[PDB]
């Protein structure tokens, strides 16, 4: 796969924001430890983490989630976004 350039990041974030916004809000809630998330957007994803813009009652906040293991290409990014969505759905059941 292609390495995680800012160009590739932009395209990943664009597609997540348009077609996977529910998953991003799950990331913000479970991995970002944010309580009453209204919506969340991905601003960037890079080898070591992702930057989320998170909306709630108190307005907007930017947070960073750091990955346990650095991403080496867009396939690593795919696998982590899949795994994080599954893990967040499991955790979000119990609050």
Q: Which residues are annotated as a binding site?
A: 11, 15, 19-20, 68, 74-75, 78, 86, 89
Q: Does 92 bind ligand HEM (CB under 6 A)?
A: no
Q: Under rule CB under 6 A, which residues in 8-67 are in contact with ligand HEM?
A: 12, 15-16, 20, 23
Q: How far apart are CA 55 and CA 51, in angstroms?
A: 13
Nearest-approach distance from CB 58 to a copy of itself, in angstroms: 32
Nearest to 45 by CA among 35, 60, 20: 20
Position closest to ligand HEM via CB: 85
Cα three-residue angle 20-88-65, rounded to 5 degrees = 80
**Token pair 């650095």: residue:** 70
What residues form the annotated binding site for heme c?
A: 11, 15, 20
Q: Does 72 bind a copy of itself (CB under 8 A)?
A: no
Structure tokens at 86: 């599954």
Q: Does 80 bind ligand HEM (CB under 6 A)?
A: no
Structure tokens at 7: 């160009």
Q: Does 36 bind a copy of itself (CB under 8 A)?
A: no
């Amino acid at each position: 796969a292609d390495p995680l350039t800012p160009a590739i990041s932009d395209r990943i974030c664009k597609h997540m924001n348009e077609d996977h916004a529910s998953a991003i809000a799950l990331y913000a809630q479970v991995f970002g430890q944010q309580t009453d998330v209204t919506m969340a957007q991905m601003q960037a994803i890079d080898p070591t983490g992702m930057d989320l813009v998170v909306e709630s009652e108190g307005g907007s906040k930017t947070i960073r989630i750091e990955f346990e293991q650095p991403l080496k290409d867009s396939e690593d990014a795919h696998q982590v976004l899949i795994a994080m969505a599954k893990q967040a759905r499991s955790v979000g059941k119990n609050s």
